């Protein structure tokens, strides 16, 4: 049963659209869906190839992710990412040197944040319990 696999690893949960939907609903109610959106945004950004034809799209995307989740140090993603990590990202943005893996560290920190609090809480939530 898919729902059982989701309790074995966060990666299993996020590899299932029903799992993602349920988990995002839970996060939304807890006021932190940005954690998951950001996680997927980094993955989506990274899979874009660094060729000339994608240059403009990639820069606009990198800026968008930065502006919404990294810029203001008050959002939940920004609050859960390290100063040095955000500094490096800002530098990539300003220099316009945006390697596909530039958000990797931030993504790892946010992934840990979910594994540490919201993921476990989700598995013990009414939403999950009801679904199962």
């Amino acid at each position: 049963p898919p729902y059982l696999k989701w309790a074995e690893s966060l990666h299993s949960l996020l590899d299932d659209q029903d799992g993602i939907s349920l988990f995002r609903t839970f996060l939304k109610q807890e006021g932190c869906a940005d954690l998951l959106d950001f996680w997927f945004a980094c993955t989506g950004f990274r899979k874009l190839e660094p060729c000339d034809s994608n240059e403009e799209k990639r820069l606009k995307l990198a800026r968008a992710i930065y502006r919404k989740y990294i810029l203001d140090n008050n959002g939940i993603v920004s609050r859960q990412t390290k100063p040095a990590t955000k500094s490096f990202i800002k530098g990539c943005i300003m220099k316009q040197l945006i390697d596909p893996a530039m958000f990797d560290q931030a993504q790892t920190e946010i992934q840990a944040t979910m594994e540490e609090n919201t993921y476990p809480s989700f598995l013990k939530s009414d939403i999950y319990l009801e679904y199962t």
Binding site: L14, D15, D16, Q17, I20, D37, F40, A41, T43, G44, F45, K47, K60, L61, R63, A64, I65, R67, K68
Partner: peptide, 16 residues
């Protein structure tokens, strides 16, 4: 820079 651009990016990373 754009929620719509972020949404397209997020969608591309979804399973299936």
């Amino acid at each position: 820079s754009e929620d719509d651009l972020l949404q397209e990016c997020i969608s591309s990373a979804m399973p299936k």
